[PDB]
Amino acid sequence: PEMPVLENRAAQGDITAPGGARRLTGDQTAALRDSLSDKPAKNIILLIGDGMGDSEITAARNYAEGAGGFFKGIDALPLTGQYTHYALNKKTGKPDYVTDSAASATAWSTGVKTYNGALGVDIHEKDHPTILEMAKAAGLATGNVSTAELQDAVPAALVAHVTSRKCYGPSATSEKCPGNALEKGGKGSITEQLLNARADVTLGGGAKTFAETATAGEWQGKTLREQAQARGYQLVSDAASLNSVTEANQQKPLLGLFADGNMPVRWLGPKATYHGNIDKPAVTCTPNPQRNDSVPTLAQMTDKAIELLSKNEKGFFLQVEGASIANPCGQIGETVDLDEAVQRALEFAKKEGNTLVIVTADHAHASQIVAPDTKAPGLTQALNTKDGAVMVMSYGHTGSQLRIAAYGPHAANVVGLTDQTDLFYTMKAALGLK
Amino acid sequence: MPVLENRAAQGDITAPGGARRLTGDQTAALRDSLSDKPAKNIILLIGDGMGDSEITAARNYAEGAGGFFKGIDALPLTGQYTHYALNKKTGKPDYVTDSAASATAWSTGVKTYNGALGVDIHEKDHPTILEMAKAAGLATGNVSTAELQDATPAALVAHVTSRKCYGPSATSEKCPGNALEKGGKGSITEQLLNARADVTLGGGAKTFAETATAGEWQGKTLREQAQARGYQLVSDAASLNSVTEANQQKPLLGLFADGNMPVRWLGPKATYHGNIDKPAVTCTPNPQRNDSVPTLAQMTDKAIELLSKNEKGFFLQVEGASIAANPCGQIGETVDLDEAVQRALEFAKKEGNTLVIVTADHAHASQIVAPDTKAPGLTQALNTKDGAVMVMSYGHTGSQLRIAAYGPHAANVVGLTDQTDLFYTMKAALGLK
């Protein structure tokens, strides 16, 4: 029946003994042969960890699971490679080696390289369709989930085509993206285009911008929240209301707004400081008390989106972003949040059997794991890990290629060296979109 | 089985689809890359400090952002491995390894403390993959552009409590338990001569001028000892080229520099705000490179030619050394390694029973940063093949990093593994006990 998920690649024994630190128990050729299918993907779930390069994965694993531990979500995908995410200089069209989130999200959502800060447009400011828009056009259900504000670059890139990622609402758009402003003849702000795109399920932060009023069109003078209500959206704002939702579709599309800005971070800790690993004690991260059972977690939004979207017989596309808001504990807790959502995605995909799950990052954070005695010129912090040993992290974004991993039909297309724009084409082809 | 022939960007990177590295679905290609048949031979290539960041920076500089390393980027099966060491007293993980503990991990399958070679945290010796290959009748090679006493080549042939124990004098001082005159197996260089790989090629002639303190060759230089023990000594490209065989009667020992072999490229050191305060750098060829000193790729090709005569098979390790905060030196070292990987893949594709593995011991701390960056450490702007500026910042590390493979049993590098799994992968692929 099922393509396998890696069940346990923790160190298998005593890490001080011969063979004790192995993560494999035997040859993987048969398992990998059994991981390969080019049958259609009925569904795709793409999980994005903001800033989640290989270093961030390693630091979080070290801290939360121990050096020899295992992320049951992030580390469990059997097919892995590395992809490149360079942007373009807008004026020259030459590579810009260090992307922002907007140019990278544009690359995987549209298959076109662009300039830093662009959403859903190329270097000539020309719109190109997104994977979510194409999935909808093919009759698939669509979901867009983030613990960031929903106007932020990663969720916005699926639904908005604007010349600057700053163009959150009518007022920023009229100022910074005048050609996109609704009353200046464009398609509108990020939030307005989101409302037009009408995904079946959209869940995240960013309530604040919905208080703005539209400047033109049918809903001029209404807030964007009022516009959503008038256009048939089901609006929820907490865990209980999200739980009360029984269906989400084009008649009653779901819009969950769970915070005015970003949703709460999982863990708190002090900021990193100059010579912090030397001058301050080792840190143990703590729970954020703003986290509570009235605010759904990334994993809970993921699971609810899967339930709702999986009702569509033709299939669904779902993107889930674990947002990042030099705070090591914040960053590590965000990786933990993403791992839980990946587990939900893989649990569903393993059972359903026709679901491609992809886990990657937009670009990497600058954090590095360094020797405990390090005297570094940037910001550092010592942390007390799950092993009862000190790990030091140093902040001294970046251009390094980074991990992409997948499970399910067409997952072979993430192995080896690829570009971030290949991810668009992988998703397009896997779902049979044109 | 297919090598990745071209994963450069396929067109105009400003146009839809023009930056794609794929031309179509890869399921069939990847399935065809998977074999569970025996490996006759293994070639393990190690780039010192070559994490994903260094691969990217060198690609961006030498090939352009959308370019492709025909060796490093062409291996079809890829994963990431963990390389943490251990605290010697507590046995808890130490999150940032040195080159010795990492080399010990893949060559013996045992984690150890930073600085250890071929011993565990209890200072107990464990056999290496090269020693096991030789015991099984396979030919063995050990190639490096570093000094041959350095951690990576040393780990295959020496068991010492500190990587500093290069020769008799340092060993007597720093590894007294290993010192020959104290009943130990000897210095790194003495254990190298005992191990008697069929092919050993690299730098580090300096330590061979020391004399042994005890044993059969007491008072002779270690070079004299090698000569006395039947080694073919060579010291330049012509002498290397004239070698027609290497085996246990006539093992080959090439010593091509006093210390490390010459770096490929020169450039200035990175400096505070160097990307702002100094012009963009174009790397230059090192005048000390010349056709009398074999390159990493040439040593790799000659080793393959000599070792491939063994009908049972061979094990070969090739290390591209990294000699502070010098972007051009570092990038040129990755280019050197890519050339050697090309030679290994060319051989492996023709021979068909060869597992080629490319990875690093641990990653350098360098990062690729925005052009306008004002960073607290050292920075440099570089003029790349794209005719654009790339900035590197220096401000070793613990990140997991790429491992890639081609040939029988290459599946065992995909996904998350540990650096110690690499030992077991090589053992099992060659059918060693």
Ends distance of chain B: 27 Å
Could you state the CATH homologous superfamily of chain A? Answer: Alkaline Phosphatase, subunit A
What fraction of the residues of chain A are assigned to beta strands by DSSP?
15-25%
CATH architecture descriptor name of chain A? 3-Layer(aba) Sandwich
What class, by secondary structure content of chain A? alpha/beta
The portion of residues assigned to helices of chain B is: 25-40%
Radius of gyration of chain B: 21 Å
Query: What name does CATH use for the topology of chain A?
Result: Alkaline Phosphatase, subunit A
Structure write-up:
- The complex is a heterodimer of chains A (434) and B (433).
- Chain A is built from 13 helices and 18 strands.
- Chain A is of the alpha/beta class.
- Chain A has one domain (1-434): Alkaline Phosphatase, subunit A, CATH 3.40.720.10.
- In chain A, the strands form 4 sheets. Chain A has a 10-stranded mixed β-sheet, with helices on both faces.
- Chain B has one domain: Alkaline Phosphatase, subunit A (3-Layer(aba) Sandwich), CATH 3.40.720.
- Chain B is built from 13 helices and 17 strands.
- Classes of the chains: A alpha/beta (434), B alpha/beta (433).
- The interface between A and B is large, with 97 and 99 residues.
- The PDB classes it as hydrolase.
- Keywords: bacterial alkaline phosphatase, Hydrolase, Magnesium, Metal-binding.
